[PDB]
């Protein structure tokens, strides 16, 4: 599995006086509490677009083709598909329920707040980990361990023919699903990071330089 943690930056509007923004809030973490209701102006108009999530929903608006609006909806807001651009008349009719979201697989880090009146436009960081898998053949070699990231040229798996080997894409966390069997060796794991060792085969207890 390759997780390509793609990133974007989207806005939202809150209750001004209600303390509803904390930095100790990570994926699957709280935002805002109990404004009955929300209906305020996210002032823009554009062609309707919506993209799916497990628990979430973006709304992008391309008037012509430029991305005029990018505002994310944490679940607990009642979306409507193709409404709004009557006079740009506060379409973001995302109903503020008594709970909030809390995006479990997408992390909410940075924060920015311009304060006025009833609401604050917030701009943050959005990284959702895309689970995409590959399948290795008998003649394919896993050059990558049980979890590490990767560069755009940082080849992952080598096969017999240079014809379509598993080349590296944009950065992704490398996890492994299906082994062909499992070794249970009674041993001791000793990780190293910086410098070089004594090779496989020799005797140690505790020996010298390990």
């Amino acid at each position: 599995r390759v997780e390509y943690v793609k990133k974007e930056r989207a806005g939202l509007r809150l209750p001004l006086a209600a303390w509803v923004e904390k930095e100790a809030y990570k994926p699957g973490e709280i935002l805002a509490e109990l404004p009955e209701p929300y209906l305020f102006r996210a002032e823009e108009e554009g062609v309707v677009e919506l993209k799916e999530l497990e628990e979430g929903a973006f709304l992008v608006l391309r008037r012509e083709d430029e991305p005029v609006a990018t505002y994310f909806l944490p679940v607990g807001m009642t979306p409507l598909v193709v409404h709004g651009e009557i006079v740009e008349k506060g379409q973001p009719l995302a109903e503020a329920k008594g709970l909030l979201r809390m995006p479990r697989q997408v992390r909410a880090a940075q924060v920015e707040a311009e304060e006025e009146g009833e609401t604050v436009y917030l701009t943050l960081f959005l990284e959702w980990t895309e689970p995409k898998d590959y399948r290795v053949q008998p003649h394919m070699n896993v050059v990558v361990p049980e979890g590490a990231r990767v560069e755009a040229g940082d080849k992952i798996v080598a096969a017999i023919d240079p014809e379509e080997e598993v080349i590296a894409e944009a950065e992704g966390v490398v996890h492994l699903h299906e082994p062909a069997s499992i070794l249970v060796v009674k041993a001791r794991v000793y990780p190293f990071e910086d410098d070089v060792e004594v090779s496989t085969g020799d005797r140690v207890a505790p020996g010298d330089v390990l």
């Binding site: 410098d195 070089v196 060792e197 004594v198 090779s199 496989t200 085969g201 020799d202």
Partner: peptide
């Protein structure tokens, strides 16, 4: 085996592979 312990990180991995290969 110790003249092999002196060759650096670039050169000892050839050893590590040579061991695993003949074994």
């Amino acid at each position: 085996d110790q003249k092999l312990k002196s060759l650096p990180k670039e050169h000892k991995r050839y050893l590590h592979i040579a061991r695993e290969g003949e074994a």
